[PDB]
Design a protein around this nucleic acid. Sequence first.
RNA 1: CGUAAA
Length: 163
Amino acid sequence: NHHLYPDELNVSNNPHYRPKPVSYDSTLPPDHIKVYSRTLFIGGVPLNMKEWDLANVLKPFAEVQSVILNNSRKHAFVKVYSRHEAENVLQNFNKDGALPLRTRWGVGFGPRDCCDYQHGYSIIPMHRLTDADKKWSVSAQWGGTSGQPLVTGIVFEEPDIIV
RNA sequence: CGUAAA
């Protein structure tokens, strides 16, 4: 819908193919999970710049999955295909400051108030996930757990949603 | 200096 490629699948022959890191963190509270964001907040987006432009400026550093732009308020939300890629964008992209864009973390998944925007993850208690959120966490195309059921301690990358 | 759509 807001994706570049709406119907794509996360499979070896797709050049956008990515693995789905799942680890388990013993220090999480009972019935809590950890979700690393793939969503990026970009601000200072000039008025002349569009969705395809933003995608292309990040091309060197990361392959872009989706772009919700809001030209009037000068911001956009850009999901990239992997957490590794997002982290690379936050360090290396626009390191000189030639472009007017500023890159900070964003929240694609779970409650907003569970997110650490400095480090870029959410520690979410499972009771604050909708049936939908629990569904997408396991069944998602990019990110998620890919079939591993949700349990205390589980850590995964931001799953794709339906909107 | 703008953190949203479900």
